Design a protein around this ligand. Structure first.
Ligand SMILES: [Mg+2]
Ligand SMILES: [Mg+2]
Ligand SMILES: [Mg+2]
Ligand SMILES: [Mg+2]
Ligand SMILES: [Mg+2]
Ligand SMILES: [Mg+2]
Ligand SMILES: [Zn+2]
Lengths: 69, 199, 137, 52, 142, 103, 138
RNA sequence: UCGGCUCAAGCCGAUGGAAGUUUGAGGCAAUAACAGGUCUGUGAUGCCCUUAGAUGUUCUGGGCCGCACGCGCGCUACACUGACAGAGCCAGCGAGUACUCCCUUGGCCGAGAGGCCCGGGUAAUCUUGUUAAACUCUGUCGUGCUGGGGAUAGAGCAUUGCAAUUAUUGCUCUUCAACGAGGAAUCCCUAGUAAGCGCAAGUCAUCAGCUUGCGUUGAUUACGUCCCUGCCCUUUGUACACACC
């Protein structure tokens, strides 16, 4: 039930080789299959948005959704 | 100047919803038309209509607001159309990405396939039931189909880490085909089966 | 990797997966407001969990906890006055609130006041209705 | 000896009463009537109270 | 063309003027920050550090839109509901000292002046010129 | 003969008498070559009172609401002080009049 | 002289008075521009009387409106009702009706409510809205 | 005015019109009655009783709130369709100054509750634009009975009243229970309606979880029938008339 608040290399490696194939990436998806905390998931959205691999479709203060580029 | 640059792209063309068009409507069956109203497009579902004065005024009415109205239930969600319209629009945006087809293209097939065709009627028998297994009218079929989708989304999202934004979205794509793993189908097959037994 | 998902401050265990400001709230005798003040006045970033801090700053928080008034905080914000006939301010902690709660009962019992007698019998001390309240004995 | 009514009565109930017949329970003082509701109803019409 | 206060969104504008006032960085503080409740109905202090600066700036925005306003009006403008427990909620006003001193300090910055002829505080000639200059700084920034 | 800009205030419970009072006053005043200002229409003042209809409390609980309406109908004139004395004569019952010099 | 027309719109408790003056194509609402004075998602419910008609027909019209009373959706319904009457009154009074008739027919076939108001108010009762108190044993 | 029925009585829809469902909702509302309620509203009232050791009046103190338990009318809740933090910002009906201060602007002091100083209003003029709540945008928290939930109790600071203990109430810190949509049973309701949310008035020196009204946002399904629980007219049966208890 409890998730991980820190991201290690064991979780880092799945991202940079898997996010190229997801159709949607959301906080629910990360807490679902990455087995990570929601706050860490939201951070994972924001650090990865600026590196230039995903594009914004709709933005809001409660939930945000991202897709492929 | 007086119009936003986003809407200036579509204003030149025929009037439609900004994100998605209303053209290329399904050709799948009959007997459900004349009760789903699409001849008059509407930009946003919200509207203060006069459809609750006579019997069949709801037959000539845009579908999207009816879904918004059925989406808000269970005490707490009374009067929040500002919240409902955004949630429904986001649900159409979410379902648009998993399938290149129009969100209304998927939604119409979703409603037309999850409607029960038979139901059991209650006839008194002094403690027993003379269930006659009557058929269901198309208007009641669509009216109950909307209810099943909305209560399915509310039940699924209740006490779950998922949010209703994509929780509502997933049923429309699930119900688009004969997946048989949705709540609406769970109620639908039980109703025809009990009618089949009680014929 | 020094992220130890367990901490031990003042005879109690706290978690490290959750935030620093609410980490201190786990120990008895402190609420959200006091934790907010001490975490802001200790110059600690709120965006990290309680496990991501280092050793040296950990003690100066509990030093503030034991001696509140020496770091320019108001007197009304504390949780103790009039220890005896002449009293001073204090900020009591987890084991302190538990220890301090009992003795006030038999002291006022010794003076034998009505409120203490109500305490002694176990019946409700504050005057309150009873036709639909406390139906457990 | 003349302290038999030393209690002051300028404070809530007891310092006011109905005009027609002395009474102190449920007296309306709004809009300066100071009359009981029971005494009020028979003499309402003449004062000018009506329905619409 | 020329732009004014009405030509910009209020929410993004207030953030821009808070960033602009960062660069001057001179408004007296009596140390009340991080200790005040900011309102009886409220329960937690604001997380963001420059809440005192966005609030002082917001007070100047509403005084810019009203002709005469006092501490009582700002007292009840920023109030909200309070969870009294098992009782139904009501409407109560925010703290008085924070809102009074946050705009008392705003006098000496040459933003608004007294209105002793009839009461309250009004906006001054050169005070409006700052928000007017920032109107063009933000309008064509788009 | 110094003009004082008179103003007279009216109050009553019934409504029909006041209208004809102003109707006769305006004609009584125009013919003397006096500058007259119109009969402005002041808001009506509605008052409500709620009390229990029953006197004992037995049976079902039902209430009734009495109500009352008031009209003001202000009028003003520009004239000296002595002239209005003979212009405000012949008033009937019910209507009360209050005079203000407004000097 | 100067070309101008006055209109007003009403709702349950929202009054929106409008002044239409011959101008150059400027639209401002309650002082604020059209970008601001609305809830974010309902801002669309402001542009339909313009987009359905065309911006080219707003060449020399200026409108100033003051609205008060009611709620947010009452105010937006008042302004959307007032715009249609302002434009049709200005065209009817000051220019040939060849435009006016097509504007009126096309607009009312899209939505009839632009020219008529919807009457809805509350009814007082002695127990609340329409429901009574709970009964003991029926 | 017109269409589709009928000789007639009458019903449904459209155009002008906001409307034609009697436009919507109210006030008043038949004969004969109940061993219904009130002598504790009345200087309305028969008879009986105590009337100076008074059941009259009045002063002090306490009680009507006292608690192993069953029942009713209500309020906050069981969370992500959520909580928290900043910003954006929309009503109506009403009330206010005496032989003593009644609603209260502005200024200063004050964490907060509060305190001090000028001033307006016997009131479409001032309070009051009552810029209320809901709601909207931007962030934090992340399903854990946890930052949902606030019962219980300690310490400190204030206003009201002659008097606050069994605290009248308010404010600050801390204590952090039960409660995962609730059994057999059961109530209300047809469009600005249900529900969600607040405001004004009453009782009031102070206290609303109460009532009477006012406003914001505003829904799913039906436009039927007499099946249960009841009502109306006629025919019919009776050994019932205090009338199927
Ligand atoms: Mg009512
Ligand atoms: Mg009758
Ligand atoms: Mg006696
Ligand atoms: Mg807890
Ligand atoms: Mg009250
Ligand atoms: Mg027989
Ligand atoms: Zn009386």
């Amino acid at each position: 039930a409890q998730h991980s608040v820190i991201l290690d290399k064991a979780t880092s490696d799945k991202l940079y080789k898997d996010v190229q194939s997801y159709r949607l990436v959301t906080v629910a998806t990360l807490v679902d299959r990455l087995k990570i905390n929601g706050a860490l998931a939201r951070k994972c959205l924001k650090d990865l948005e600026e590196k230039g691999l995903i594009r914004q479709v709709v933005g809001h203060s409660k939930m945000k959704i991202y897709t492929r580029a | 100047d007086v119009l936003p640059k986003e809407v200036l792209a579509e204003v030149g063309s025929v009037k439609l919803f900004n994100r998605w068009s209303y053209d290329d409507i399904e050709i799948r069956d009959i007997s459900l038309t004349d009760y789903i109203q699409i001849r008059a497009p509407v930009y946003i579902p919200h509207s203060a209509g006069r459809y609750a004065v006579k019997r069949f005024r709801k037959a000539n009415c845009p579908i999207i607001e009816r879904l918004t109205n059925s989406l808000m239930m269970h005490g707490r969600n009374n009067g929040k159309k500002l919240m409902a319209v955004r949630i429904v629009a986001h649900a159409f945006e979410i379902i648009h990405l998993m399938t290149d087809q129009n969100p209304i293209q998927v939604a119409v097939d979703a409603i037309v396939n999850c409607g029960p065709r038979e139901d059991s009627t209650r006839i008194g028998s002094a403690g027993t039931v003379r269930r006659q297994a009557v058929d269901v009218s198309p208007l009641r079929r669509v009216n109950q189909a909307i209810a099943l989708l909305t209560t399915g989304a509310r039940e699924a999202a209740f006490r779950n880490v998922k949010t209703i934004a994509e929780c509502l979205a997933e049923e429309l794509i699930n119900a688009a085909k004969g997946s048989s793993n949705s709540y609406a189908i769970k109620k639908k097959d039980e109703l025809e089966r009990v009618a089949k037994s009680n014929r | 990797t020094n992220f130890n998902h367990i901490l031990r401050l003042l005879n109690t265990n706290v978690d490290g997966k959750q935030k620093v400001v609410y980490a201190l709230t786990q120990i008895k005798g402190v609420g959200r407001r006091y934790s907010n003040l001490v975490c802001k006045k200790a110059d600690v970033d709120l965006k990290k969990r309680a496990g991501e801090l280092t050793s040296e700053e950990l003690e100066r928080l509990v030093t503030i906890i034991q001696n509140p008034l020496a770091y320019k905080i108001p007197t009304w914000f504390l949780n103790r006055q009039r220890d005896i006939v002449d009293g001073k301010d204090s900020q009591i902690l987890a084991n302190g609130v538990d220890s301090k709660l009992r003795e006030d009962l038999e002291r006022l019992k010794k003076i034998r006041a009505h409120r203490g007698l109500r305490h002694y019998w176990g019946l409700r001390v504050r005057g309150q209705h009873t036709k639909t309240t406390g139906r457990r004995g | 000896e003349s302290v038999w009514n030393s209690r002051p009565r300028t404070y809530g109930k007891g310092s006011r009463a109905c005009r027609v017949c002395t009474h102190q329970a449920g007296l309306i003082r709004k809009y300066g009537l100071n009359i009981c509701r029971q005494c009020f109803r028979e003499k309402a019409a003449d004062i000018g109270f009506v329905k619409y | 063309g020329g732009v004014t206060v009405r030509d910009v969104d209020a929410h993004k504008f207030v953030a821009a003027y808070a960033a602009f006032l960062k660069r001057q960085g001179k408004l007296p503080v009596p140390g009340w920050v991080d200790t005040v409740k900011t309102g009886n109905a409220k329960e937690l202090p604001p997380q963001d550090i420059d809440w005192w600066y966005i609030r002082a700036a917001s007070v100047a925005r509403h005084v810019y839109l009203r002709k005469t306003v006092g501490v009582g009006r700002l007292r009840k403008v920023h109030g909200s509901a309070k969870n009294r427990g098992t009782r139904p909620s009501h409407h109560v006003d925010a703290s008085g000292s924070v809102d009074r001193k946050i705009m008392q300090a705003l006098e000496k910055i040459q933003v608004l002046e007294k209105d002793e002829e009839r009461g309250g505080r009004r906006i001054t000639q050169q005070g409006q010129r700052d928000l007017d200059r920032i109107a063009q700084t933000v309008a064509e920034a788009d | 003969p110094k003009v004082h800009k008179i103003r007279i205030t009216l109050t009553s419970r019934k409504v029909q008498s006041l209208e004809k009072v102003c109707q006769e006053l305006i004609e009584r005043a125009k013919n003397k070559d006096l500058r007259v200002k119109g009969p402005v229409r002041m808001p009506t003042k509605t008052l409500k009172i709620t009390t229990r209809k029953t006197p004992c409390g037995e049976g079902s609980k039902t209430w009734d609401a009495y109500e009352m309406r008031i009209h003001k109908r202000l009028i003003d004139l520009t004239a000296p002080t002595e002239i209005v004395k003979q212009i405000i004569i012949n008033i009937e019952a019910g209507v009360e009049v209050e005079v203000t010099i407004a000097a | 002289s100067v070309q101008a027309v006055q209109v007003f719109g009403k709702k349950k408790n929202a009054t929106a008075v409008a002044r239409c003056v011959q101008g150059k194509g400027l639209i401002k609402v309650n002082g604020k521009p059209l970008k601001l004075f609305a809830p974010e998602i309902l801002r669309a419910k402001l542009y339909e009387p313009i987009l359905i008609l065309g911006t080219d027909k707003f060449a020399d019209v200026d409108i100033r409106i003051r609205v008060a009373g009611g709620g947010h959706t009452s105010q937006v319904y008042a302004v959307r009702q007032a715009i249609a009457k302002s434009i049709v009154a200005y065209y009817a009074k000051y220019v040939d009706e060849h435009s006016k008739n097509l504007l009126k027919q096309e607009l009312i076939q899209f939505d009839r409510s632009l020219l008529v108001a919807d009457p809805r108010r509350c009814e007082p009762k002695k127990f609340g809205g329409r429901g009574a108190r709970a009964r003991f044993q029926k």
